[PDB]
Amino acid sequence: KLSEETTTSSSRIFVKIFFQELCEYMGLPKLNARLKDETLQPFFEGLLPRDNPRNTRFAINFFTSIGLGGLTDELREHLKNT
Amino acid sequence: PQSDLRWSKQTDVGITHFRSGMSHEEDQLIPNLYRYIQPWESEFIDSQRVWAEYALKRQEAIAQNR
Amino acid sequence: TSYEEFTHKDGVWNLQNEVTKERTAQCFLRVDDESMQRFHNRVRQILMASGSTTFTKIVNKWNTALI
Amino acid sequence: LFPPWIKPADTEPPPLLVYKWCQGINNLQDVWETSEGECNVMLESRFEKMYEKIDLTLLNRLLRLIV
Amino acid sequence: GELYLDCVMHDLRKMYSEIDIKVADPVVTFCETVVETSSLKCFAETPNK
Amino acid sequence: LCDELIRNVKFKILDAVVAQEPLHRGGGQIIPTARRVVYSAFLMATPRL
Amino acid sequence: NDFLSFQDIATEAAHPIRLFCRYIDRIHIFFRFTADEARDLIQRYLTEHPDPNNENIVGYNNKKCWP
Amino acid sequence: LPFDHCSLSLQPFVYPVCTPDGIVFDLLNIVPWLKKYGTNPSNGEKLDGRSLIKLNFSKNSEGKYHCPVLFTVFTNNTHIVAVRTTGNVYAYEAVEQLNIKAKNFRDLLTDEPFSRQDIITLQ
Amino acid sequence: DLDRMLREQEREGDPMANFIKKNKAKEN
Amino acid sequence: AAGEQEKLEATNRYHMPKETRGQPARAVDESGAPGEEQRRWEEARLGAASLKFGARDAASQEPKYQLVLEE
Numbered sequence: 001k002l003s004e005e006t007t008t009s010s011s012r013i014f015v016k017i018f019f020q021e022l023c024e025y026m027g028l029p030k031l032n033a034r035l036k037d038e039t040l041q042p043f044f045e046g047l048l049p050r051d052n053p054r055n056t057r058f059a060i061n062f063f064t065s066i067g068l069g070g071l072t073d074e075l076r077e078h079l080k081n082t
Numbered sequence: 083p084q085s086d087l088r089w090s091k092q093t094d095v096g097i098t099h100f101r102s103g104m105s106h107e108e109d110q111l112i113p114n115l116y117r118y119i120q121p122w123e124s125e126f127i128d129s130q131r132v133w134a135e136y137a138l139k140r141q142e143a144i145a146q147n148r
Numbered sequence: 149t150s151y152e153e154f155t156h157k158d159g160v161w162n163l164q165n166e167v168t169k170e171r172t173a174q175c176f177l178r179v180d181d182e183s184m185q186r187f188h189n190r191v192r193q194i195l196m197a198s199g200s201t202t203f204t205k206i207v208n209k210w211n212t213a214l215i
Numbered sequence: 216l217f218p219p220w221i222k223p224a225d226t227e228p229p230p231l232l233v234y235k236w237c238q239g240i241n242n243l244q245d246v247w248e249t250s251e252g253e254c255n256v257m258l259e260s261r262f263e264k265m266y267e268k269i270d271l272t273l274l275n276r277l278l279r280l281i282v
Numbered sequence: 283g284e285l286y287l288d289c290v291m292h293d294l295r296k297m298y299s300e301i302d303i304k305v306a307d308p309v310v311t312f313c314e315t316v317v318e319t320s321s322l323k324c325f326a327e328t329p330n331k
Numbered sequence: 332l333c334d335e336l337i338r339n340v341k342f343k344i345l346d347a348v349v350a351q352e353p354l355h356r357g358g359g360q361i362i363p364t365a366r367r368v369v370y371s372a373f374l375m376a377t378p379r380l
Numbered sequence: 381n382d383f384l385s386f387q388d389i390a391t392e393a394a395h396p397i398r399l400f401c402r403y404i405d406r407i408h409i410f411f412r413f414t415a416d417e418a419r420d421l422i423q424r425y426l427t428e429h430p431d432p433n434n435e436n437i438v439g440y441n442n443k444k445c446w447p
Numbered sequence: 448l449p450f451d452h453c454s455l456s457l458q459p460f461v462y463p464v465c466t467p468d469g470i471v472f473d474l475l476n477i478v479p480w481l482k483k484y485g486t487n488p489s490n491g492e493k494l495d496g497r498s499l500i501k502l503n504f505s506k507n508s509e510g511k512y513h514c515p516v517l518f519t520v521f522t523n524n525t526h527i528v529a530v531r532t533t534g535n536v537y538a539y540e541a542v543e544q545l546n547i548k549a550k551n552f553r554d555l556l557t558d559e560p561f562s563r564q565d566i567i568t569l570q
Numbered sequence: 571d572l573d574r575m576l577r578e579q580e581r582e583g584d585p586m587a588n589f590i591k592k593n594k595a596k597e598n
Numbered sequence: 599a600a601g602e603q604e605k606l607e608a609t610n611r612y613h614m615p616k617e618t619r620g621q622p623a624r625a626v627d628e629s630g631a632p633g634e635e636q637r638r639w640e641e642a643r644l645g646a647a648s649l650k651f652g653a654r655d656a657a658s659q660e661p662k663y664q665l666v667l668e669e
């Protein structure tokens with residue numbers, strides 16, 4: 001769960017390193033295709049809540065501060081219109 | 083590892099069989115040296131990460147004069 | 149590359165792009181035949197000089213050239 | 216005096232030199248896209264008789280320039 | 283059949299030719315059928331149209 | 332399909348807009364025209380091996 | 381520069397000779413050619429060395445260790 | 448589909464045969480349709496075995512479906528003129544200028560000279 | 571070495587420390 | 599300093615040594631001696647270890663996503 005209240009700093013660093021190896025060994029448009037399919041959004045809603053929008057802000061700034069950006073542009077426009 | 087000698091010259095067909103190195107006393111499990119030497123790609127990646135982190139540590143030591 | 153990337157036993161360098169930080173190619177790695185020729189000739193030198201060399205020193209020569 | 220295209224340099228091992236050469240071929244721009252005949256030519260060669268044909272008077276004239 | 287064709291290839295390799303001749307894999311031959319009708323009333327015409 | 336013999340197909344002719352007395356274009360051109368007709372009618376008829 | 385940096389992508393592509401590595405005498409050059417320049421070089425090569433039977437293929441030396 | 452396809456069989460040239468009427472098609476298609484008819488099936492004009500000419504399934508100094516004299520790729524899409532006496536098809540303008548200015552209907556390697564009046568339309 | 575453990579965890583990549591640094595850069 | 603710099607790359611040329619009758623004549627020189635060689639070896643190891651690829655014009659195609667943060 002991408003929640004800054006509950007997850008540890010080690011958990012955030014772990015998720016950052018895991019997603020960095022994902023973005024290295026396979027492409028980022030392919031990663032967005034793997035991450036934006038509707039079937040795994042019941043399993044992505046822990047990662048992508050789009051609710052309690054300071055956690056959405058944490059997810060946006062986390063996937064930007066890893067070095068990616070991009071993956072939370074949908075969360076960025078969610079934060080814009082909500 | 084053993085595979086097809088017909089398709090070994092043309093293609094790459096994976097591993098189908100196994101042959102022993104030499105006849106040793108049953109199980110043995112005598113450890114191979116490649117499982118103690120680190121791979122080159124991991125060595126280069128960890129080298130670049132460690133040297134960049136050392137550069138930031140040296141920059142912080144200069145900046146704080148610590 | 150057809151299909152997808154190749155999950156390989158460390159003898160293929162997945163080649164990371166400098167810009168996108170993504171693997172864009174694969175570098176299959178093998179050993180030159182003259183390297184095995186020179187290594188076999190080094191073992192042949194070891195057995196050549198083995199006629200007047202103790203067992204511990206033979207093991208040292210083997211282990212030194214091997215590592 | 217020596218520009219850093221000249222190898223063996225003291226800075227890197229030859230496996231790291233292999234990795235540097237591979238990543239330099241990797242991180243060029245539009246290098247794999249051969250759609251319009253932009254062919255990629257890898258040439259590995261030698262100098263053969265680079266030693267025995269060195270004239271010492273010409274080397275003297277060239278080294279009076281250097282040192 | 284395979285025994286018949288091995289006998290034929292043996293006769294070729296021994297009596298009817300002295301040459302060692304490479305043999306490919308044995309396969310079978312097929313025919314062509316259809317499942318549904320031609321969905322287009324399709325036409326052609328002569329070179330003088 | 333893959334140069335095999337065609338079997339279990341009924342070839343039903345629907346229209347034949349033929350000029351009366353083809354003669355010069357009937358002297359060896361109907362047979363490749365009919366071959367093109369058979370091939371083209373076989374193509375959209377969803378064939379199987 | 382270092383071993384494998386230039387000033388610009390234009391400074392790469394201003395010449396077909398892109399990347400260079402001299403290891404004592406072993407010369408390793410990466411070229412990127414265009415189709416017209418490649419055809420012109422082929423034309424001048426066949427101008428000096430005509431081959432109507434297309435015999436240039438069989439004189440090639442390839443890496444036999446690979447499949 | 449292209450101009451290199453046969454006139455009768457509508458397939459590309461591998462073992463083609465030409466004719467005196469300028470019709471180049473498949474030899475197997477022209478065999479059964481004109482063995483007893485004796486006429487070219489492009490337009491019904493008469494073309495017997497003496498009128499018909501071979502176009503492929505043979506050997507050459509070039510060794511391909513190219514120009515025998517000009518040594519270039521003179522396909523059916525290109526300006527190709529076929530020598531009826533020789534049976535081979537070369538380029539139109541290049542072999543015409545070679546047989547006119549240089550007076551060379553000969554090959555590049557074989558060097559077999561001929562006349563420029565035997566050229567007919569290959570396509 | 572739990573002190574070195576928490577020292578590495580505080581001198582690590584630390585995305586929340588990056589958010590504090592960027593938020594103070596934006597507020598300043 | 600601009601006049602001295604004009605003299606400095608007036609001096610900084612190729613300027614091959616003259617062939618001298620007999621022994622050559624020694625000229626005057628230098629850099630900072632006390633302590634600087636330790637940092638010279640430190641950044642020598644840093645330059646021998648650190649590595650990058652691409653040309654010097656390689657900062658292009660950067661979208662530079664900023665943090666949206668809290669309003």
